[PDB]
């Protein structure tokens, strides 16, 4: 039970950062432009059982475009990403959508305005109307603050499973191994622990 999901949008909009957040929980601060596409399995647990998205996270930058519209072939859903602190990224949403629906007629699509966490927003809420005539779901999101971060996937799952009351649910949690001891020595542990202590945790000003 898996669905091909294409993620498109201008470079630097936060596509890869968003996916990573979903994969590992991590927040990647550095900008390493995606080369072509990266495919990632991504599973969610729902009251209608597990759903798997094969996420085709594509390149936004023309020079790293690679296959371009070829990546969309047989996609069953998509996310279009822009950045609310960069007007040009919204101005380009129609171009991404054009290329996407020429290959993928009739699929559920979410439009996402990333980086709402940043104070000086440039693409005002009132401005964001492109999705209406194109029947796209829209969400304000922030990969950084995790604001509405689940919403794109919950909505897509609802559309693809065809159940409007689908919820994410708590995955079962097996009793973990009581046999903690593996190597008697644990020499390797001591080197890692000292390094880990003396490397500062990021974002020590955040509320958590």
């Amino acid at each position: 039970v898996q669905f091909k999901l294409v993620l498109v949008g201008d470079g630097g909009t936060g596509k890869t950062t968003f996916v990573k957040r979903h994969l590992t929980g991590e927040f990647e601060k550095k900008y390493v432009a995606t080369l072509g596409v990266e495919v990632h399995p991504l599973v969610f647990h729902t009251n209608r059982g597990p759903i798997k998205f094969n996420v085709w996270d594509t390149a936004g930058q023309e020079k790293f475009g690679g296959l371009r519209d070829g990546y969309y072939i047989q996609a069953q859903c998509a996310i279009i990403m822009f950045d609310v602190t960069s007007r040009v990224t919204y101005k380009n949403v129609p171009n991404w959508h054009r290329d996407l629906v020429r290959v993928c007629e009739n699929i559920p699509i979410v439009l996402c305005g990333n980086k709402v966490d940043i104070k000086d927003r440039k693409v005002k809420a009132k401005s964001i109307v492109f999705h209406r005539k194109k029947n796209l779901q829209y969400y304000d999101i922030s990969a950084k603050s995790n604001y509405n971060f689940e919403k794109p996937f919950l909505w897509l799952a609802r559309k693809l499973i065809g159940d409007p009351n689908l919820e994410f649910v708590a995955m079962p949690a097996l009793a973990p191994p009581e046999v903690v001891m593996d190597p008697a020595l644990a020499a390797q542990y001591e080197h890692d622990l000292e390094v880990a202590q003396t490397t500062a945790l990021p974002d020590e000003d955040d509320d958590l």
Partner: protein, 128 residues
């Protein structure tokens, strides 16, 4: 007159606190967030064994699942007065038992100190 036609039920909650969990990536020499949500100390009513179970907010995906082993030691992180670091040899959150160096930061220093107190109590319970 005929009418209308997780595995945590068997565990007790000793302690719950909001927190952010990191794991150390030795290759990158950087801390990476693994999850944000409720960190719970769960005492199995059948074994009396106490575990950490932590779920991400909204997705509810497990980002920590491991026994509060007697051998573990909470250590300070150079950057924080509200975090603990420790080595864990068997976390099954992402499936197959794996070793991680974890860090866990709290909203306040009191929370961090409370966590440490509870953590050491749970270690005691786990010894018997």
């Amino acid at each position: 007159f005929e009418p209308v036609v997780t595995m945590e039920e068997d565990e007790e909650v000793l302690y719950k606190v909001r927190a952010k969990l990191f794991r150390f990536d030795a290759d990158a020499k950087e801390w990476k967030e693994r999850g944000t949500g409720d960190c719970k100390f769960l005492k199995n009513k059948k074994t009396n064994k106490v575990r950490i179970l932590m779920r991400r907010d909204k997705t509810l995906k497990i980002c920590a699942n491991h026994i509060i082993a007697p051998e573990y030691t909470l250590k300070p992180n150079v950057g924080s007065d509200r975090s603990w670091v420790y080595a864990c040899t068997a976390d099954i959150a992402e499936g197959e038992a794996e070793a991680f160096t974890f860090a866990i930061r709290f909203g306040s220093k009191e929370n961090a100190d409370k966590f440490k107190e509870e953590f050491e109590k749970a270690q005691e319970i786990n010894k018997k």
